[PDB]
Symmetry: D2
Subunit: 399 residues, 4 copies
């Protein structure tokens, strides 16, 4: 029969601003810092880790199979496995599943999962450079948009799909700005109070004149007020309800985690932090991808036999304020769920802290656990929508 | 209670030459052709497919999560799952594992796997364009190399790790050119004989049509191989002819739990027996198969002799000759070439990286079917070192 | 006291096709070949040449002040002067004027003029690369168009200004295709007959060699011209075949004061009589010659009848038919095609922009020499409108 | 016989910093501002100007025959001539010659000369984009270097040729920094005192929130001291004497001038500012291009029958401090000239004010005149070295 899987170490870097504090740190070097932190915290010798499952949305520019580069540099054995997975925003959560199911089936005993996105260092593409443009102008493409944020099925930017959710359920700019403010404010609150200090591993910038250190998330807007939110123009559509402040940002980050079979963790005398309960995907139409969590969360709860009210804390990534309010509505209408804001996103989410696409899937799992630990809770869950529709959700317990 | 996994449909496009007959068709449309072919050969309604696991080495330029695009265009339901996986050369073989483990654990009942590489359409990269070059020249990088064929751990192109194996085992070029020739000739023979016509779905150009593998060096002679200069090292044994080629191709397969196939009334073609990864040092990643094949065999309770036929990709002639030998010295295996790569391999037919991992699986089965055999296996080395191997049986 | 100006040596390379036989040779090395040819045909020691006036339309990609590089490689003394001039299509004809005015005023005694366009090697531009794109797609611009063929004043490609002339004078396509055909056929005839062998210096490829003009549409028929679609306007009279082509070529000439040529014991080939510019509105820049030819004729005291032969570049069939007519209506000139463009022109032989201005001068002379004639003239329209014209005589 | 030529109007924009105040103004729009200023100051109807001779070093990116665009936009008649000339740093001075010799020979009566270089907006090149890179990496080239500052004949940057002059004549870092300081200090002096206000025409940046105006040259280094000059590292060679402070800068600018036959200026009742006396080129080896002025200045003086001491004021462009000190030496050794620093570059030159390559050739002529006018002098001269060697010099008088 299948093994039980546990998490033994978890870490993430700060979430940097687009072209901000971490713009000088390429994705692989952020992954190495987060991976080393998780490995040390677990107390496992990197030489016995069986594989690395690396998550990222934009491979381009980071070399041949970056996860193999990241694994070898943190000391994985050359015998270890390596692969790179992408499910857009849920990349880190799908890497977690792939690794855990490998452990479930006995294929591995210890698996490293890295999730990273350095959106400040995504290159531009020259599509016709190989065979030549022959004649006439072409396009030098921003890969972060053409290969990531701009969905072909949706027809435009992710923000447009949030506008669809606002239209369908009739969400207004006032409701979006209200929710968005709390995220910026909650994020500001937790950042300055040091709530993220435990999970964070700092990133050190090796400047020539000196040596700077990034230890704090830097996306949230300080001094946000309900009237300041109302002063921003629409960011993606004329008269659209989505703005830069009520929409998740563009950001850099890397998260990592060490997973293990329950019995391997016991053999090594290590401390299991929490146990995988469930994890799965479930899609919605690309044009309303934001509602994915409203179908993934009930599904994973069914697979595990839990009721929504059983989960002690939730980390539901806020891609856009309208997107969240659409999830609340769909969860009330087509599910029997009244989203418990008192046990969900306590310290801000994507809107306030940012959305490093490739890292976020695992980021919210890391943050979920450490919030459980700070509040002495037991059962946690994390879900998030995905560009294209295929959303994910996962459930965990601290035994 | 763990579910049995069977393959109901498989397809692949012809293996086009670098900048050749398929250069005008992008990766996504190549994957769509193969997937539609595998779907109709399985005879399943694409509306009930639970997920797509898409393999490719270079995502750059192909849009947002191509596997989601590929799935929706071939008719997957919006509730289906989607993801992109890369294990360099074995990407197609890892996507298979991922989908098969989803079926093993009951997460899904029907999973579509696509594996594609359009190396003719890999874009070039401008790394400093976003923040600006400010002053001074920059680099317009060939992503095919910087993000694929050139490995930092190995210190250079994949061909250097082939040269490293040559030095380790003192493999001369004559052995490299001799193996390469038989790979080119075998590919030419099987292409002209139409052996690949069953597995192939043709690519229509919007009105020309490509339907034959076009990489094999025709008229290859023992001595034409000797006149070519080394390609990656001064005085090295690796040449363009005895090295795998750069190519375009797409392969697809529809997997299912055995209970689902019976319920739907379809015919399982072969059942998964074993699948696994196992790595070697990046400097000699070509030796990967020599550790992955004995492992998957041990995992499955199979001895090497049980396998009727193997599809073992030839990344480089020196690499294969190193695998033949490491298997002899550190394993108890004398590689049986009479039961391995009958119809040319990576050297003769080409190496469309993203698709190869699954391509050899497809070629494996149809050779089992053509020879009335039962047990088959496939394995391949991987850039970086993490090789893979798999075992299958038609005796469901 | 103003000095008399004579031409002692002239040369030109074959007119290669866009991305054709000369695509591998850059502008500078094409100019070096022509210049060396003109130098030895003049029989002058390049060490005493006082300056080089280099013409080209697209400097981008050819290094720092190419004319200085060209001069030093063909053996000009370091004390020599150097400069680059551009009047789009007439660049070669303006460089000639500049050098001839330097000789007229005693500033120099020997001036070398090179005129080159390697349109196959014009680079693409990244306008935002320096400061950064920050976010969002950008443009990779074809400089050949943005910095040359596409004119902002005219509102579009050079072909639209040809269409504008067609509407102004109601010129149908049948007239355009008919003139185009004779230009293609005449070019084919003269190419095969070796008439251009005297003026041509062949280009050696490092070991193939190009020596014949390769643009003429062979087997051109009245009805093949009618099946081609319009190229620049919906329902427009301009097609690729009746429009001038994109090409590569270099021409060179060594000018001298008549007193210097006698002092050195060399043979003057022809003497400058008149040269000037005169513009028209950019929207109908093709009509330029209809104002530049009567002006230079008036400037020189020559009537049109005095000129034995003309080389008038054909930018577009409609453009020439407009020039023929504006010359009739506003000037007293009925353009004598029996004494104009005997051996194909821009439509048949191509339009290597930077070189054309001087190329037609070279072709003019050798036709005068081939026919034993004396007085010659050359003129051409220019992107933007500032056309030029010149008059020459072998009766020094 | 040949006509006498006069200048009737002159203007230039401020010299902006590389990527500085004028980085948003493309070369053609700077040329239009300078051209309109010169035309208005001359008091000539633009509809009768016979031609425009446009000077610039880097055409790329500025459209089809920019001088024709610039001429039509300032109101030249469609009958007028147009052409673009380049002699690297002497581009503006060669455009002046071409136009003047056209007037000398009766080909034109009124000629507009524009000289511009917007080095902040020089594009990058993709050389193999047309036919394709086929396979392997290429180079995305900085055209300002590959097509301008980097000389193939010299083997490297212009700064290297200045190092050759320092080596040949044994010029030391101390002598270079001393001269360079005075240029920065003299430039600072004249800028703040408004000495350039007459010749300058301001450039207006049409920002959205507001409207900013550039009216002052912005290259000179404020607070320069002899010890601050000694603190900068070599900019182009190990242990080289050339630094960013003692080397001319990278800058944006446009200058323009209206030239006329003496008799055409009289017919229109206009005021001739000064009369062309002489103008010519003379080259030196590309590897020591800096010494060009030491051979061009004596030559033009011979053509005109003047002695060096006859010139009331000189504008000799300082490309590099070592380059100038080499000119002083060559003028003393191979010419009989003791460079009169008391009548040369009173208000700083290329080192202090900057070196917009395409505009400088005419810039120093404009500045030369207005310094003559401020000091009530009569005879002026302007010369400058050129990348590759072909240098130029010109002589003028206020009658």
């Amino acid at each position: 029969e299948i093994n039980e899987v546990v998490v033994v170490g978890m870490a993430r870097t700060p979430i940097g601003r687009y072209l901000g504090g971490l713009a000088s740190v390429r994705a692989n070097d952020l992954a190495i810092i987060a991976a080393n932190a998780a490995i040390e915290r677990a107390g496992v010798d990197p030489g016995i880790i069986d594989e690395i499952v690396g998550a990222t949305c934009l491979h381009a520019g980071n070399g041949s199979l970056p996860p193999r580069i990241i694994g070898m540099k943190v000391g994985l054995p050359v015998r270890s496995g390596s692969c790179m997975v992408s499910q857009n925003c849920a990349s880190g959560m799908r890497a977690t599943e792939i690794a855990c199911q490998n452990i479930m089936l006995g294929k591995t005993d210890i698996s490293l999962v890295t999730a990273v996105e350095s959106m400040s260092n995504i290159p531009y593409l020259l599509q016709q450079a190989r065979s030549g443009y022959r004649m006439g102008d072409g396009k030098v493409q921003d890969a972060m948009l053409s290969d990531g944020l701009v969905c072909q099925l949706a027809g435009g930017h992710m923000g447009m799909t949030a506008e669809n959710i606002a239209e369908k359920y009739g969400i207004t700019r006032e409701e979006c700005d209200a929710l968005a403010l709390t995220s910026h404010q909650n994020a500001v609150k937790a950042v300055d109070e040091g709530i993220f200090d435990r999970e964070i591993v700092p990133v050190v910038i090796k400047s020539k004149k000196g040596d700077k250190v990034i230890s704090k998330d830097e996306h949230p807007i300080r001094g946000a007020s309900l009237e300041t939110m109302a002063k921003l123009p629409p960011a993606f559509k004329k008269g659209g309800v989505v703005t830069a402040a009520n929409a998740s940002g563009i950001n850099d980050c890397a998260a990592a985690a060490v997973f293990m079979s329950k019995k391997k963790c016991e053999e090594l005398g290590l401390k299991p932090l929490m146990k995988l309960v469930g994890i799965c995907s479930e899609g919605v139409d690309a044009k309303v991808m934001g509602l994915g969590p409203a179908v993934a969360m009930p599904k994973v709860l069914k697979q595990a036999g839990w009721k929504y009210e059983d989960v002690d804390y939730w980390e539901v990534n806020e891609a856009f304020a309208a997107q969240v309010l659409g999830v609340v509505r769909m969860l009330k209408e087509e599910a029997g769920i009244e989203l418990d804001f008192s046990k969900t996103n306590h310290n801000g989410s994507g809107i306030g802290l940012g959305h490093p696409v490739g890292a976020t899937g695992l980021r919210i799992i890391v943050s979920m656990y450490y919030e459980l630990e700070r509040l002495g809770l037991t059962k946690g869950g994390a879900s998030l929508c995905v560009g294209g529709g295929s959303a994910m959700a996962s459930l965990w317990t601290r035994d």
